[PDB]
Write a protein that binds this DNA or RNA. Structure first.
Length: 49
DNA sequence: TGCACAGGATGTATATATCTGACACGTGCCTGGAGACTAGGGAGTAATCCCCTTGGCGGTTAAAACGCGGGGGACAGCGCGTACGTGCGTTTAAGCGGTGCTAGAGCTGTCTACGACCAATTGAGCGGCCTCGGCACCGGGATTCTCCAGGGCG
């Protein structure tokens, strides 16, 4: 769906996903596996990183 | 002539009468001791409600805890000299005995403002409420600010 929004319309935008702490990496690895053309960040190191 | 003595001519602690100071005892007028009436302030109870707990699993984070390098600052050793410690003689001035005063300190009537005590009104101040503009927190970016490596210089 997120990849369909890029081809169908011109809307990209910053998105947000809320994932449990265990599956946090599976969405990044899944974003490199599936649909490489997206720019994805992650969240670690609350006080500093 | 050189010498010991008997008595006067001065000291000196010794014993006696004498001068303050403080403890001890005998009063009578402003205190306490006590008796009765009023009453409102204190002891006692009936809900109450309201925030404050009970007990312990896990997941995760921010804060607490440990560990080593070493850099600089606490700290011991030691020499110097001038700044007070110590000891004299010389002076200015307080302690103290005594004096003449006064002007302010100190106890007592008058009344008179004038504040203590008590009804009537209310309005300005307190419980309740519900908003929004100032406030909380952080990005963007410029600015300063300290840390480290030559090198030109000793």
């Amino acid at each position: 769906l997120l990849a369909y929004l890029a081809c169908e319309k011109e809307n990209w935008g910053p998105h947000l996903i809320v994932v449990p702490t265990s599956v946090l990496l599976n969405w990044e690895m899944e974003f490199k596996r599936f649909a490489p053309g997206f720019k994805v960040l992650t969240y670690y190191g609350s006080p500093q990183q």
